[PDB]
Amino acid sequence: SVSFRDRVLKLYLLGFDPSEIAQTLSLDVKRKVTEEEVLHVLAEARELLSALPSLEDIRAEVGQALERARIFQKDLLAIYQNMLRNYNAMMEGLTEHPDGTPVIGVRPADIAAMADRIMKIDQERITAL
Amino acid sequence: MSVSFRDRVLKLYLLGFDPSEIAQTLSLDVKRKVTEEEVLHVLAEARELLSALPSLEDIRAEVGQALERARIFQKDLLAIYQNMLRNYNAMMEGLTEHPDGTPVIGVRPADIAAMADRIMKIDQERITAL
Amino acid sequence: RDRVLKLYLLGFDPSEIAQTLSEEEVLHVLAEARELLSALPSLEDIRAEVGQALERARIFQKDLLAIYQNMLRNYNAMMEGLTEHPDGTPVIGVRPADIAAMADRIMKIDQERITALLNSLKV
Amino acid sequence: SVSFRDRVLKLYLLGFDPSEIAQTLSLDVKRKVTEEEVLHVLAEARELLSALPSLEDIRAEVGQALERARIFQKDLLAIYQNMLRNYNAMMEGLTEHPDGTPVIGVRPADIAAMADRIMKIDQERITAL
Amino acid sequence: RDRVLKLYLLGFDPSEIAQTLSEEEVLHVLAEARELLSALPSLEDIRAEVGQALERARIFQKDLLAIYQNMLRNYNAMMEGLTEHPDGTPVIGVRPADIAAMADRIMKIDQERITALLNSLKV
Amino acid sequence: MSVSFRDRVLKLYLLGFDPSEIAQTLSLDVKRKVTEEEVLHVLAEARELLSALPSLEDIRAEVGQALERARIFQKDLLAIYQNMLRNYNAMMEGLTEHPDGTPVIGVRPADIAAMADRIMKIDQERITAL
Amino acid sequence: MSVSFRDRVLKLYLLGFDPSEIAQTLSLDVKRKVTEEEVLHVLAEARELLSALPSLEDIRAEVGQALERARIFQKDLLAIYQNMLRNYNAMMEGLTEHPDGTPVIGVRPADIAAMADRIMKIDQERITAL
Amino acid sequence: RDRVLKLYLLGFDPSEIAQTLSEEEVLHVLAEARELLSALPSLEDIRAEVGQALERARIFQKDLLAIYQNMLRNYNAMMEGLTEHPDGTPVIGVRPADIAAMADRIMKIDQERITALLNSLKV
Amino acid sequence: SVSFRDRVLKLYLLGFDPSEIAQTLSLDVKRKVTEEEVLHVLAEARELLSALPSLEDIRAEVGQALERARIFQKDLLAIYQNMLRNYNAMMEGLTEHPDGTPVIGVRPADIAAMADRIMKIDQERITAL
């Protein structure tokens, strides 16, 4: 299989030796496998890993890193609004919101901490471009 | 096929879902048998668009947003700073509640100095960026 | 109009922005706002931002100096053995390290000011 | 007034917008004030803030920073003597001093910490000169 | 034979290595092993080590992304007020700072990858 | 007017008192109506003197004091180091009091290593400064 | 006199024993009156050998060991990582014991991210060294 | 005479120095002391300060090595299960991280010595 | 004596002045000693300390620093094996080892911490060479 070869490559990188990789795959698949069958799959995959990246592939990986950072920034921005909404409710002396959900106590430093980590994603994106 | 389909395939890959799991979830949304090589081809198209270099005004576009977002955060923290300083002055003079009626929360000097520094850090980061 | 740009930066997508105001109309305003933010700032715009920032720093520095004097007034009252001040306010506990920490943060505002004025003269 | 214009400039930098600045000054002063009256005071003060410093004014600000540091150093030096005086009394097994004041417990690291912060003010002054 | 080199690096002296296997025979094998390790590595050997390391990084990155989604799924359940998830698993407490910390460590794996691929192209 | 008046005006300004509050407090000391523009003029005179550049021997004057002050601190910490080491040796061998009669205080190895490092830091800062 | 005698004299000096204490302890091992100037002469011989500069392949000898030792540590930590991740998955789904029978220990997300980082640090240190 | 310079550096003003000894006489001695400290140091003066500092470092290094051996002797006694040593002294608890921390600080004294001797040869 | 002169040089560097050095040696040795006897021993030793190192002596001191680091590395490596041996016993649910000694609880981070400090000694040795 294709996923069988990936499972072998994963276990090798995760620290298992060919002997341990053969035992674990003998529980997954019915038919047992020898070390030469494992080592040849390694020999194929290891030469593919050693393929040096083109200059365009690094720029591709930079563009993906920025896009992944935008996704985290959107998740963190939604959390920042919840923290700030909770902070205003804490000062007003409310136990529940107008929505109905419970007010959770948030410290000023935690809001400013969350602000900095959202702003640092911008700075790193500017530095990357 | 769609505009959101292009973005959703790339989103799930960047959140750690492999091509197999992307195919299964997108089959529920867009009611078809979505193939694994279809997901990989969309990934390949996405990597080509992302590998293109940014323009000089596209850098200015991102810089302008970062500084404007910093201004929005700075006003949120500036409001928090005034509350802390108002609380400190009330605590210093032995008050439990303010004139308006809201309760006096205890604040340490180091917290006020810390909050001030974070506000000034944003201004330094603005000036340096310009 | 400015409020649309605010909600975009705070993390709300175009669809959610239309719901609060009440999508295709919103996306165009953000595209126009992109070109405004994409414009290169003038030197006189930068001089204004440096002037405002350093004046805001002086306001904070004046607030922290007022707190430094309170910490110092408390320390001498604590050391002399007083529970209460002459004016009637209570004597709060202060650690020597906190006074030095407060002094350090006041002194760094001068250093941050000098460094900003140094970089401004070159650029 | 002159202090009225400074109050407006302070509130603007502290984060208030012209609408909020007009409301707060309407409580301080009897007669209410419009936004154009506020914005024109901003327009005067903002152009004065944008005045670029002469090379002599930076040297002036350096000299003041060193003089402010000398004042803090004198306050910290007086505290260092109190810590050391207390440390010697702690070893001797005294609860009160010969003066009459109470002995307070001080750790060795706190004295050396206070020493370093006094010495760092010198180093920074030497670096500044 | 490789096991002798392992025990030497783990801190056991030649005398103790002979006791586990069962000294002069051991010292010679280490001297021969020294010359093998003293050999300069090829470029294709380095390309393999960079390929393995960055692939191992992707495996960790995929594991941490799976944990990030769990933390995020827990946070929304905690905020909405649920004790239990739909599938039957318990809702665990998550602090906002821990989610940002997890995001940061995932983002640094991209930065560490880009820096390693940048240094590889030059060398 | 006076020598201490010049210094006291500058001191209060550097401690965060504005020209108005400086005028009020100095009116009590020097028994006159001290004007705000008088305080501002003294501030202006002070800024001119401070803006003057330092001489090369004036740098050596400050450097010489900093190193001599470091020697005074080093002897204070060196005495503290011997007390900690004397305490450690007594604690190691199960003693409650010393031969002289003073009580044995508990000390950790890391504290002695920390105190030693701070003493050696002063020597590094001395050598580097020279 | 001996090979181990040369090494043992240098070892005791580097562990903080002075020439007097080295002479006393070595007199018990090698049953003679070991002189202080004999210890100092062995120290002098040792300093001459250590002062000699390293060869270019001697650097490669040490580098090769450091990377191989790093691989041995990395496999020890990689095994620990799998145990933590196996524990986390069991804790997530409300299990007290594993299928094999061993007990489920609680693990935090930050610990797994910390352990992963240390494993990746070794790979960075390997690549950089090469 | 040296005691006047000591009290000035410790933070006492000229007025307070006259009170302890028992102002215009004190200010002149400080002005004369300023010129002495203002004098540029010789190379032989610097060589003395480097020699004293590195010899003082060896004294500390010898003290920390003696403590390292005690920590190590305690660790082996703790691991073997002993409460008391052969000589009669008590076995104290030691954490592995503290032993490595102690080793690190001893090793940095060698590095600080080598760096100081390197900078001295140039200057 | 020779050790008497070293005791004087030690006490001077440890912070004692000639007056205090004379008092302490008057308790150790029967016959009391004057300050000129102390100061002349200082005068001899201080000129010997000011002897500038040859380039070979620095290389000698580097070689000793590396050899001292190897000794610590061997002590730390033996501790690492004890931590790892304990960690495996903790997972297996053993209170005592097959040897007989008690199992002590060790955290994963402490093992990886100990690993890094052993590996950092190598890195610093490579950097030194």
Q: Locate the chain F residue with the closest alpha carbon to C58.
A: F16
* Gyration radius of chain D over CA positions: 25
Number of H helices, E strands in chain A: 5, 0
DSSP helix/strand/coil, E84: strand
DSSP helix/strand/coil, E22: coil
Count of alpha carbons within 13 angstroms of residue F102, beta-carbon side = 14
**Nearest to B120, CA basis, from B112, C118, B86:** B112
Count of alpha carbons within 13 angstroms of residue I36, beta-carbon side = 0
Cα–Cα dist I83/H82, whole Å: 18
Report the DSSP beta bridge partners of residue F97: F103
**Nearest to F35, CA basis, from F23, F44, F46:** F23
Spell out the alpha helix ranges (H) of B15-108.
19-29, 36-51, 56-92
CB contact (8 A) between residue G51 and residue I59: yes
Chain B closest-CA separation from residue E58 CA (Å):
10
**F79 within 8 A of I15, measured Cβ to Cβ:** yes
**Nearest to C6, CA basis, from A73, A76, B68, A87:** B68
Out of E46, E89, E98, the one facing G110 most closely (by C-beta) is E98
Phi and psi (nearest 5°) for A48?
-70, -40
Count contacts between D and F (CB, < 8 Å): 81
Cα–Cα dist H75/F100, whole Å: 32
Structure tokens at D86: 């207390």
The widest CA-to-CA distance across chain C, in whole angstroms, is 71
CB contact (8 A) between residue C61 and residue F15: no
Cα–Cα dist I35/I46, whole Å: 16
Structure tokens at E75: 């946070």
∠ at Cα H84 (H82, H88), nearest 5°?
150
Chain H closest-CA separation from residue I106 CA (Å):
10
The dihedral built from the CA positions of residue D8, D14, D17 and D20, taken in this order, carries a sign that is: negative
Q: Which residues of B23-55 are buried (b: 16+ CB within 10 A; e: fewer)?
A: beebeeeeeeebeeebbeebbeebbeebbeeee
CB contact (8 A) between residue B64 and residue C38: yes
Resolution rounded to one decimal, in angstroms: 2.6
Cα–Cα dist I58/H117, whole Å: 7
**A18 within 8 A of A34, measured Cβ to Cβ:** no
Phi and psi (nearest 5°) for A97?
-80, 170
Cα–Cα dist G38/G1, whole Å: 11
**B72 within 8 A of A81, measured Cβ to Cβ:** no
**E54 within 8 A of E117, measured Cβ to Cβ:** yes
Q: Other C-beta atoms within 10 Å of A89: how many?
A: 20
**F98 within 8 A of D93, measured Cβ to Cβ:** no
Cα–Cα dist I50/H43, whole Å: 10
End-to-end CA distance of chain G: 41
Quote the DSSP letter at residue F96: S
**B117 within 8 A of A115, measured Cβ to Cβ:** no
Report the DSSP beta bridge partners of residue A102: A96
∠ at Cα I32 (I27, I34), nearest 5°?
125
Place of tokens 């006189």: C44
Residues on B contacting E at a C-beta cutoff of 8 Å: 15-16, 18
The CA dihedral of E101, E106, E107, E112, to the nearest 10 degrees, is 120
**Nearest to G18, CA basis, from G40, G42, G49, G2:** G40
Chain I closest-CA separation from residue F71 CA (Å):
10
The dihedral built from the CA positions of residue F73, F75, F76 and F82, taken in this order, carries a sign that is: positive
Q: Other C-beta atoms within 10 Å of I32: how many?
A: 11
The CA dihedral of C28, C32, C34, C38, to the nearest 10 degrees, is 160
Q: Which helix (H) or strand (E) holds I120?
A: helix I108-128
**F125 within 8 A of F83, measured Cβ to Cβ:** no
Q: Which residues of H84-118 are buried (b: 16+ CB within 10 A; e: fewer)?
A: eeeeeeebbebebebbbbbbebbbebbebbbebbe
Q: Other C-beta atoms within 10 Å of A40: how many?
A: 12
Residue type, I44: E
| Chains touching I (3+ CB pairs < 8 Å) | E, F, G, H
CB contact (8 A) between residue I126 and residue G66: yes
Way it was determined: X-ray
Phi and psi (nearest 5°) for E84?
-130, 150
Place of tokens 């690549």: G127
Count of alpha carbons within 13 angstroms of residue H47, beta-carbon side = 13
**Nearest to A119, CA basis, from B74, I85, I52:** B74
| Helices F56-92, F109-129: inter-axial angle, 10-degree rounding | 160
Report the DSSP beta bridge partners of residue C90: C84
Structure tokens at G31: 């049953």
∠ at Cα H50 (H45, H56), nearest 5°?
125
**Nearest to A11, CA basis, from E56, G102, G70:** E56
Cα–Cα dist H18/I42, whole Å: 34
Place of tokens 């050696």: F120
CB within 8 A of H29, min separation 6: which ones? H1, H4, H5
CB within 8 A of A97, min separation 6: which ones? A85, A89, A103
Chain H closest-CA separation from residue I62 CA (Å):
7
| Helices G56-92, E2-9: inter-axial angle, 10-degree rounding | 90
Cα–Cα dist B17/B9, whole Å: 10
DSSP helix/strand/coil, B97: strand
DSSP helix/strand/coil, G15: coil
CB contact (8 A) between residue F80 and residue D118: no
DSSP helix/strand/coil, I105: coil
**Residues of chain I neighbouring H61 (CB-CB closer than 8 A):** none
CB within 8 A of C52, min separation 6: which ones? D13, D46, D49
Report the DSSP beta bridge partners of residue H90: H84
Q: How far is CA D67 from CA C106, D121, E85, in A?
A: 13, 11, 63
How deeply is H79 buried, as exposed, middle or buried, from its count of CB atoms within 10 A (0-12, 13-18, 19+)?
Answer: middle
Quote the DSSP letter at residue A129: -
CA E55 to chain centre: 11
SS in 3 state form for D74-111?
A: HHHHHHHHHHHHHHHHHHHCCCECCCCCECCCCCHHHH
**C11 within 8 A of A78, measured Cβ to Cβ:** yes
* Gyration radius of chain C over CA positions: 24
Place of tokens 């402490």: I110
Mutation for F interface: D111, D114, D127, most F CBs within 10 A: D111
| Chains touching B (3+ CB pairs < 8 Å) | A, C, D, E
DSSP helix/strand/coil, C90: strand
**D6 within 8 A of B70, measured Cβ to Cβ:** no
* Gyration radius of chain G over CA positions: 25
Chain C closest-CA separation from residue F15 CA (Å):
6
**F13 within 8 A of F43, measured Cβ to Cβ:** yes
Mutation for H interface: G11, G12, G17, G22, most H CBs within 10 A: G17
Cα–Cα dist A64/E110, whole Å: 9
Place of tokens 């010198």: D122
**Nearest to I69, CA basis, from I9, I7, I126:** I126
Q: After which residues do gaps appear in chain F, with C to N over 2.5 Å? A: none
CB within 8 A of A31, min separation 6: which ones? none
DSSP helix/strand/coil, E59: helix
* Gyration radius of chain F over CA positions: 25
Q: Other C-beta atoms within 10 Å of G15: how many?
A: 18
**Residues of chain D neighbouring C100 (CB-CB closer than 8 A):** 76, 79, 113-114, 117
CB contact (8 A) between residue G120 and residue E56: yes
**E23 within 8 A of G89, measured Cβ to Cβ:** no
Q: What is the DSSP string of H48-96?
A: HHHHHHHHHHHHHHHHHHHHHHHHHHHHHHHHHT-SB-TTSPBPPP--H
Place of tokens 């011989």: G45
* Gyration radius of chain E over CA positions: 24
Q: How far is CA F111 from CA A31, F37, F92, in A?
A: 62, 55, 15
**Nearest to F84, CA basis, from F121, F110, F119, F112:** F112
Cα–Cα dist E42/E40, whole Å: 7
∠ at Cα B6 (A129, B10), nearest 5°?
55
**G84 within 8 A of G111, measured Cβ to Cβ:** yes
Structure tokens at B128: 């340096």
Cα–Cα dist F68/H37, whole Å: 8
CB within 8 A of E95, min separation 6: which ones? none
Structure tokens at F84: 């900690």
Residue type, I14: L
CB within 8 A of D93, min separation 6: which ones? F102, F103
Cα–Cα dist C7/B72, whole Å: 10
**Nearest to G85, CA basis, from I108, A9, E91:** I108
**Residues of chain E neighbouring G65 (CB-CB closer than 8 A):** 9, 37
Quote the DSSP letter at residue G94: T
Category of I70 on φ-ψ map: left (φ > 0), alpha (ψ -120 to 50) or beta: alpha
Count contacts between C and D (CB, < 8 Å): 85
